[PDB]
Design a protein around this ligand. Structure first.
Ligand SMILES: CC(=O)N[C@@H]1[C@@H](O)[C@H](O)[C@@H](CO)O[C@H]1O
Ligand SMILES: [Cl-]
Length: 299
């Protein structure tokens, strides 16, 4: 589909919309538990946002093709590092603390670059759905901090611990793009009672254009001792180091898996830190039996 005007009932942001900034539209929602939506027209929005609406909010970006991130014309951008901001969450261009939030066809970036942690988006709530979005940074791009989260047909870019936190998260049909040497995932799962997983499913892992990273990228390292990550049914380019995974938390016992991957980076004969698994995991395992209630099935 093309989305070139506000869907039914949505507030409008843009040069010729009701609100000039995304922040103004978010403010306009006020305190309400009713479902709401905002349509953002083309532009670069130099804003830092906290999404804490009490109801179920959907944010839609303008695009000629909703099925991909490649035609997005809405960018939310801000630049600050976590040391300067005072925390990881405070460094985030977008901070999602609203259950049931969905975002479609929006790019989010932190422009800090290499040298310190600088979050593009933090997801810190349950039933978060992201469709056709881009998330760009270098160190700590996507803070999947907590809660059940689903990313479909998104582009996640960075170099160092750029998908990190303790969310239970499913990445489906995403392009995961390294722009520097480092580990892609850094899960902070830390207790046996934690039922969470990262599942990277039918994704494409590759270098950013113009950057040479052959064997310089790791699938992950353990931010805490019980990090659990599976890459399944995915394409892994020659960026993946033969060891596959690397170290971080002392005394870590990560649960790291691969199942039915392909590509130049998928040979498992020299891997370290892995566990055997005989089948791919499903979304019921990662997101709970109720995933069908909140995931948008058109992706
Ligand atoms: C008032 C309303 O729309 N509530 C919905 C709920 O029915 C649904 O299960 C959930 C999915 O995330 O979003 C919220
Ligand atoms: Cl918190």
């Amino acid at each position: 589909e093309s989305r070139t005007s506000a869907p039914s009932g949505c507030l409008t942001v843009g040069s010729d919309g009701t609100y000039s900034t995304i922040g103004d539209a978010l403010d306009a929602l006020g305190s309400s538990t009713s479902s709401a939506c905002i349509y953002v027209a083309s532009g670069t929005y130099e804003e830092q946002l906290t999404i804490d609406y009490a109801g179920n909010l959907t944010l839609y970006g303008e695009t000629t093709d909703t099925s991909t991130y490649k035609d997005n014309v809405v960018t939310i951008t801000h630049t600050i590092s976590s040391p300067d901001a005072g925390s990881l969450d405070k460094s985030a261009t977008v901070n999602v603390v609203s259950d049931g939030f969905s975002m479609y066809n929006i790019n989010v970036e932190n422009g800090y670059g290499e040298g310190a942690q600088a979050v593009a988006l933090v997801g810190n709530a349950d039933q978060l759905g992201f469709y056709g979005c881009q998330f760009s940074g270098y160190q700590d791009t996507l803070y999947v901090k907590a809660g059940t989260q689903y990313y479909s047909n998104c582009m996640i870019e960075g170099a160092v611990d750029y998908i990190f936190g303790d969310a239970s998260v499913w990445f489906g049909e995403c392009d995961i793009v390294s722009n520097g040497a480092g580990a892609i995932t850094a899960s902070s799962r830390e207790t046996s009672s934690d039922s969470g997983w990262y599942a990277i499913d039918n994704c494409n892992i590759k270098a950013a254009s113009g950057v040479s990273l052959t064997e310089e990228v790791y699938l992950g390292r353990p931010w805490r001792v019980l990090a659990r990550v599976i890459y399944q049914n995915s394409v892994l380019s020659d960026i993946i180091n033969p060891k596959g995974w690397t170290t971080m938390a002392d005394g870590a016992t990560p649960l790291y898996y691969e199942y039915n991957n392909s590509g130049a980076g998928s040979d498992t004969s020299d891997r370290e830190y892995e566990t055997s698994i005989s089948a791919a995991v499903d979304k019921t395992t990662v997101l709970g039996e109720t995933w069908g209630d909140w995931i948008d099935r058109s992706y």
